[PDB]
Symmetry: C3
Amino acid sequence: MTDPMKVILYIAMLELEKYIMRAAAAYALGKIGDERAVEPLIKALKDEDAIVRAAAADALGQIGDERAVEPLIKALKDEDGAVRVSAAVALGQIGDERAVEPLIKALKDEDAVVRVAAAIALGLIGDERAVEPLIKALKDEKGKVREAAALALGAIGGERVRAAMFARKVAVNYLETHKL
Amino acid sequence: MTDPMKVILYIAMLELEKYIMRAAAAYALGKIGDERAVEPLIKALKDEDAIVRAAAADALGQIGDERAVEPLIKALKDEDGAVRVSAAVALGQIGDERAVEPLIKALKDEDAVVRVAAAIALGLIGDERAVEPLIKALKDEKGKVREAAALALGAIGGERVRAAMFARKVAVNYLETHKL
Amino acid sequence: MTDPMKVILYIAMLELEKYIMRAAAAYALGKIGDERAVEPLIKALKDEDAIVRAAAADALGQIGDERAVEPLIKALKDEDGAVRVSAAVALGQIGDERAVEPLIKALKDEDAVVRVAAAIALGLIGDERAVEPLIKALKDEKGKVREAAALALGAIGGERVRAAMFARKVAVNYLETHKL
């Protein structure tokens, strides 16, 4: 089975009645990385089942096609926290600067998992506009949100991060990391 | 854990109450490829849960053991479209000529996903009896069915396909492909 | 995405409402192998959904951190057979001798799948205390339990196994195996 065959087959399987088969298809298309799946998966972002929407968003992140930026920014407002997580991470992996301001807003999402996801996505994008919000997130009441904000700050780097550089131990290791 | 251990364990897990665990087991046995799983997975083709039946059929396709041909041809008549998809593809990957006529019939299945799956399976088998039906499928009302029929025709190749060689663009690229 | 990011993200996803997303997270952490996930997955061993508990136990087996021994021995008493399977195998992969006596008891679990799982885990641990029980398991009414006991005996090896070495064909191949 050539990869073109797989893509056509798994794209067609996005219309199967079982939500599990649709999510497995969306995940498969993500692994292959063929851009023929982008618009179909963008449509899958409106699937009735949240599991399908999360899989489609996660797959679009793998493919890394900028066409999915605006739909995934719309997906950031999904009712299901799992979907907002995948949308956030998928936007980080895509790396398009357009996702920064919607992600900064996601950084105050009520769901701490979404906040964690929002923190990491900003680190992947690397836009310096995320430094200040990420430092405020180092004060988050949820420990895992803080850890995510620290890792994201390290991923950005840059002179501005060096300037700004729990929070004490992060910068110390960051500064020692920076010198090394 | 040696692969023999895995096979015995995942074969035993085909009897767990959770349909998800049974499908995950069937999928695992498919990845290992040990033929000890063939008859158990042939039995799994009658599992109550369609997800299990699709996983067992997909796994049998991976193993490529001709013992699964007749049961999978029976699986082609399954009530659940996802199961008929896996049965069709599994028969294509197995490549046994016995599956041609049942697959040609599947090429007119009401479910377009099944038709897509039927088209690709015939391309994998490579039997020239599928040329004429596949050309009629190039006129399918569903675009993805046509694309599948074109790819399948290219996979068969052969002088007869060259003789016969949307439809216009397929043969042109096919003929230019053929010369190159 | 650096592996530290993934770990923090998938650890955070152990709190998503969808049991599927929690199990997928637990499985992901298992593949990465980062020990930051051990205590979170130990907590996941009490998840309401059996699928999550089985995934967390299976992931802990992959990580191989001895901290999971006592919780997984407690997991061996889980109401759901799939969970007891994963707990048993996870203890085998961890290889801690403390799991031998609880596994020997699991070898008489009413669920034959659990017995299969218990047999293999003892083979992975290699503790000679399992020889006698494993030989009695060669008389199990379930064929797959016997096959598992034979493979486990071969994995232990040792002079004591050589001393002791369906059952006839196992030792013959074992003795011929031993000489070769």
